[PDB]
Amino acid sequence: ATVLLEVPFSARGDRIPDAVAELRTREPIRKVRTITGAEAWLVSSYALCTQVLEDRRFSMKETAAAGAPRLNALTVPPEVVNNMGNIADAGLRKAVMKAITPKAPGLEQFLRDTANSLLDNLITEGAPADLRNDFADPLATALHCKVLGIPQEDGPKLFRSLSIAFMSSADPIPAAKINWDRDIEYMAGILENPNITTGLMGELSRLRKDPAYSHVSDELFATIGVTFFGAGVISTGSFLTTALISLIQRPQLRNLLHEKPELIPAGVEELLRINLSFADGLPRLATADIQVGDVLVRKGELVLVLLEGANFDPEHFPNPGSIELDRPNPTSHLAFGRGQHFCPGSALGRRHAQIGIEALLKKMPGVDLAVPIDQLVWRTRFQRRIPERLPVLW
Ligand code: HEM
Ligand SMILES: O=C1CN(CCCn2ccnc2)CCN1Cc1ccc(Cl)cc1
Numbered sequence: 001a002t003v004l005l006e007v008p009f010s011a012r013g014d015r016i017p018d019a020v021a022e023l024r025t026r027e028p029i030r031k032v033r034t035i036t037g038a039e040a041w042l043v044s045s046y047a048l049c050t051q052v053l054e055d056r057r058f059s060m061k062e063t064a065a066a067g068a069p070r071l072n073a074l075t076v077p078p079e080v081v082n083n084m085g086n087i088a089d090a091g092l093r094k095a096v097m098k099a100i101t102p103k104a105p106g107l108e109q110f111l112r113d114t115a116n117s118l119l120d121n122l123i124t125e126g127a128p129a130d131l132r133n134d135f136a137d138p139l140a141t142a143l144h145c146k147v148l149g150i151p152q153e154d155g156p157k158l159f160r161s162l163s164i165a166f167m168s169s170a171d172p173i174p175a176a177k178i179n180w181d182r183d184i185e186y187m188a189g190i191l192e193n194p195n196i197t198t199g200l201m202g203e204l205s206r207l208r209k210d211p212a213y214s215h216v217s218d219e220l221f222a223t224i225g226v227t228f229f230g231a232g233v234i235s236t237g238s239f240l241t242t243a244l245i246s247l248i249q250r251p252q253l254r255n256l257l258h259e260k261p262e263l264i265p266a267g268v269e270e271l272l273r274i275n276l277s278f279a280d281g282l283p284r285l286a287t288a289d290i291q292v293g294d295v296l297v298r299k300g301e302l303v304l305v306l307l308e309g310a311n312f313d314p315e316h317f318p319n320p321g322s323i324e325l326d327r328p329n330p331t332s333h334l335a336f337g338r339g340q341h342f343c344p345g346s347a348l349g350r351r352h353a354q355i356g357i358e359a360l361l362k363k364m365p366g367v368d369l370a371v372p373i374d375q376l377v378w379r380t381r382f383q384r385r386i387p388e389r390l391p392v393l394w
Contacts, residue, residue, distance in 0.1 A: 004033045007304065008040060008168075009376040012247075013242045013276040013385030020044060020061055024309055029293045031107045032304070035170045035381070038069035040302040041282060041295060045284050046316040046334075052305050053338040054137065058284035060341055061085060068124055069302040071283045072168040072383075076227075077177040083227050084341065090216045095207060096224065097344050098145055099200035100232070102351035103147030104177060105248055107146065113353065114142045117361035123363065126369040127393040131360075132386065139356050140237030144229050147348065149199025150190055158229055166234050166383040180226070187225035188218065201225055232345050234309070235277070235351040238384040243271040244360070245376075246323070248369055253323060266325040268353045272321065273311050279385045281306045282337065310334045317330035342388040364394035 009017045023030055031261060043049050052058045062068065064078035079086065087093055102108060106165040117143055122129040129135070144301035161179040190196050193204050204221050208212045247254055249265075257267050281304025286297045297303060311333045312320040336343035343349070369392055376387040 004031060004039070004291055005042075006031045007034055007040070008280055010281050011380045011385055011386070012372060013378060014245055014376065016276065016312055017022055020306070020309055020312065024313060028309075029093070029297075034069075034071050034072045034073065034302075034304075035168065037170075038071070038302060040071065040281075040283075040304050041292070041297055041307060042304050042309075043292065044171045044306045045293075046310040049305045049307070049310040049334060050338060051285060051292060052303055053334070053341075055059070055290065056340055056383050057286065057288045057290055058303055059287050061283060062285040062287060063283045065285065068285055068300070071280055071302065071304065073170065073172045073329040075165055075167060075169075075173060076180060080223060080227065083223065084344065085225060086220055090220055091212065092204075092216070092220075092224070094209065094246045095203055096200065096228070099203050100228065100345055100348055101346050104147075108351065108355065110146055110339070111139070111143055111355045112359060114169070115139055115356050116363065119236035119359060119363040123394075128391040129143070129393075130246055131390040131392050132237070133389060135195050136240040136244065136356065136390075137233075137237040140240065140352065143236065143348075143352055144233045147199055147232070148225060148229060148303065149202040150198055150225075154186070155367050158186070159233060162230055162234050163382075164231055168381050168383050183226045183230075184219075187222040188227060191221055192216070193285060196393045200228060223297070228345075232348065234384060235343075235345070236349050238277045238347065238386045239272070239275055239387055240353050241266070241390055242275060245369075245373075245387070246274060246324075247273055247357065248392070249367075249373065252322065254361065254367070256363075257357065258365050261358055263325055264358055265350070266330065267323070268331050268350055268357065269333075270323040270327075271353070272323070272350075273317065274328075275311075275335055278307050279383055280304065281309075305334075309335050332358060364392075366394045367392050368394070 019373055024044045028048050029041050029043050032040050043052055061082040064081035087096055108356050118135050141159045145152045147156045161183055166173045190201050196202050208221055284303045288298050288299055290297050314320050330366040336346040337340045371391050379386050
């Protein structure tokens with residue numbers, strides 16, 4: 001006898017388990033057990049993943065309901081699971097979305113200058129360099145301090161909450177509440193701080209005092225700061241880290257992108273498609289009985305949308321494990337989700353990665369791992385797959 005198949009399958013972000021393609025072929029919606037002991041439906045084909053993400057009867061916010069089967073423990077107050085919904089309801093969606101585009105004057109120049117300064121410091125110090133802790137993550141943190149309008153010197157302390165905040169735990173995490181409450185207090189002070197006039201926090205600070213927003217709660221304004229910082233920093237630093245591994249392991253591609261940097265955007269789109277940064281499927285709770293493939297999902301059941309299941313599906317992306325810069329459907333991957341909850345930071349995340357890669361390849365065209373790939377240490381029970389350190393030479 002064997003137990004019910006457990007998720008997640010592997011915390012390694014450098015290879016996809018052969019198991020995923022076997023599941024997709026045999027049982028593209030299959031029962032699994034999560035780390036909490038709950039049962040869930042794991043969806044692993046492009047067609048069924050799209051179906052789930054485009055049907056709002058598979059609800060994000062209802063995953064926070066008391067008593068529901070859970071992927072993992074909440075790390076925020078349950079209303080924050082409906083974060084973008086709350087933003088929309090407050091009339092703040094357009095403003096938030098405008099503040100987080102990479103098109104603000106000087107932002108791309110700031111990103112480039114920051115990337116180049118980080119790389120120059122690594123070059124001065126000498127190999128080996130850690131491209132996660134001393135490049136990708138500080139570039140993410142600096143970008144988000146700029147986007148938010150908060151001091152660069154406050155980035156590191158906000159960043160250090162994230163190794164706990166984005167845990168994927170069976171049980172509530174006491175440190176997550178301590179850091180959440182602290183980071184909320186910080187953002188509440190930022191809204192009252194007259195020096196903060198630019199970026200997302202500067203714009204929220206002004207809307208807070210405008211009559212059209214007089215009944216929006218101060219808790220929501222502070223929450224938007226904490227959540228956008230954390231979500232953006234963890235996602236962009238983690239994606240860039242694991243994309244650099246995929247690039248370094250493909251010297252022919254590295255050389256092509258170094259020689260023809262106009263191909264970087266197509267390259268980043270393929271790196272997005274093959275990315276294994278999300279450690280778990282995206283959770284949804286059924287609010288009705290819904291047919292998904294051969295399974296009738298019942299009301300109140302948990303469904304997990306496996307992004308790599310979709311993005312490595314050969315029926316949608318032929319030769320899925322190969323980076324091909326001339327696919328006819330290049331942006332049709334699910335790396336930023338799909339439907340109601342499609343990532344509002346998608347443009348910023350593309351630009352962060354494009355600029356970080358462009359700068360790396362110009363400064364370190366010989367970049368290579370400085371340890372055998374199997375020696376990377378993959379963070380466990382976390383919402384992202386990331387190596388603890390990424391040692392390189394050049
Ligand atoms: C390469 C970088 C990123 C990746 C791969 C990524 C991926 C995703 C995915 C897959 C979703 C959908 C989640 C779901 O449907 O359950 C999503 C939603 C979200 N992303 Fe990102 N993201 C990135 C960058 C960012 C940035 C830079 C921000 C903010 C500054 C951000 C903020 C959010 C928010 C707030 C949502 C929820 C949207 C809603 O619920 O309507 N992300 N992202
Ligand atoms: O606002 C969101 C959106 N998330 C979408 C999936 C993760 N993600 C992050 C970036 N791109 C995708 C889910 C959770 N929350 C609430 C939340 C955000 C940030 C913190 Cl620090 C605490 C809670």
